[PDB]
Design a protein around this ligand. Sequence first.
Ligand code: HEM
Ligand SMILES: O=C(O)[C@H](Cc1ccccc1)NC(=O)[C@@H]1CCCN1C(=O)OCc1ccccc1
Ligand SMILES: [NH3+]C1CCCCC1
Length: 454
Amino acid sequence: IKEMPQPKTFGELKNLPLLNTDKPVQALMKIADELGEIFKFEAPGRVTRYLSSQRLIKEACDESRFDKNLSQALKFVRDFAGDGLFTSWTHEKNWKKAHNILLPSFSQQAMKGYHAMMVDIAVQLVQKWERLNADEHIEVPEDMTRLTLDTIGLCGFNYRFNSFYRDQPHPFITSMVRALDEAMNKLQRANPDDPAYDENKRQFQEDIKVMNDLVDKIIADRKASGEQSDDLLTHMLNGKDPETGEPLDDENIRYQIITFLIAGHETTSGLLSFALYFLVKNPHVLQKAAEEAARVLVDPVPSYKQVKQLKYVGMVLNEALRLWPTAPAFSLYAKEDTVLGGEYPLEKGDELMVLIPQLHRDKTIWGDDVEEFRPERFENPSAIPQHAFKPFGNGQRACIGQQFALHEATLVLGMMLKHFDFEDHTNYELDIKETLTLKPEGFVVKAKSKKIPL
Ligand code: HEM
Ligand SMILES: O=C(O)[C@H](Cc1ccccc1)NC(=O)[C@@H]1CCCN1C(=O)OCc1ccccc1
Ligand SMILES: [NH3+]C1CCCCC1
């Protein structure tokens, strides 16, 4: 039975002012490097424990002992994502109901149906880059976000955001980004009810109303048209939970669509951005990935079956998820009193945070080369210890979008590697911006066409 270390305190504010930073996950990573596999983090009225080692996280991932917790960030996101899958408690009726209805929409089999829409958007990205002038560069996270937002719009509800036609965001996305920014800004606020935050509160209620009004109108328009497009909205309007025999109600469908738009804007775009960063920083790896793309993608338009054969590209994506998992933390609570690692007693209801980027740097798992980008680490999943690699979370509350994200990212990265050579023309210095997720801010490259027709 050991006493847990704790980072520096600020009197009555305890550890809260350590979150007064634009890069809180990276700050928590530095604290984990100093204090080790577990540390206590206290704010007024709140205690959590940050876990960094596979030794402790493999126990945290036991669903008999721990369930998903809503962190303070997720409680703030729940003000607009409601009881959608990501912001619901496992015990709320609408979690298992929506999970049972939506699982078939998110399977490998479903990806065969989404593939044509994903190719539509991927071809728009390749055409944009083919059309750049010699003196121009690519803004990588900006273009990857155009692609992933457009993909979830088309697969989600047959809507074209037309992100490659504009600089100005869609009014929904203006409100969503500003609401996500307010939810994250709220975390550090010592005096949230100070009148200096009244305008923030007013703008937040306005942004919630915009997102609700626009998505409610999408649902109403679809019910009115009667059209049966093969998209998530059709599946939710027609689907019945096998257990209850009930469909989702229109309010819950709105929360699911808001949730999918957050995910499609925030997550896969970061994965693609980090993958291209690591490829241009590791030219021998880029060469091996480019050779696979050329060997496999023998048709002007990739097929579903061809994407499944981009094995090394899949390993490149896993190794980018290892070093910079774009959804970098999840939260758990103890279902009953239990002892963690034979050393740390917990009481029922006690909270844990899993710091995924630290788990992924555990040298006892990956060896001394842990900071190196080596996709070959993923050649044999049976050679990777249990619960060593958790970029999509854990158990029944793992990412429902995992197959969707990896299909889109594999397709797009395969097509990028087939069609272009890349240059890190600025010798870009990694600068990681934090929202709900991680992205490489200011990452730019030049692309030289291999002049292969679509
Ligand atoms: C690289 C891309 C992505 C990553 C790294 C990622 C990561 C995660 C993680 C770590 C969780 C667990 C959260 C927690 O325990 O609190 C999660 C849950 C979830 N993700 Fe993703 N995600 C990605 C893409 C997507 C996409 C594309 C969608 C949907 C279009 C999506 C929808 C969801 C949903 C709905 C949940 C909640 C599942 C549930 O509890 O039933 N994600 N994701
Ligand atoms: O939101 C939290 O509770 C904690 C930070 C905190 C705040 C107040 C007291 C004590 C701790 N959040 C986090 O540690 C991380 C880092 C910043 C945001 N965050 C988080 O979990 O965001 C939600 C999220 C993102 C991705 C996947 C699941 C959930
Ligand atoms: N995919 C989930 C985790 C990251 C934020 C969006 C929902």
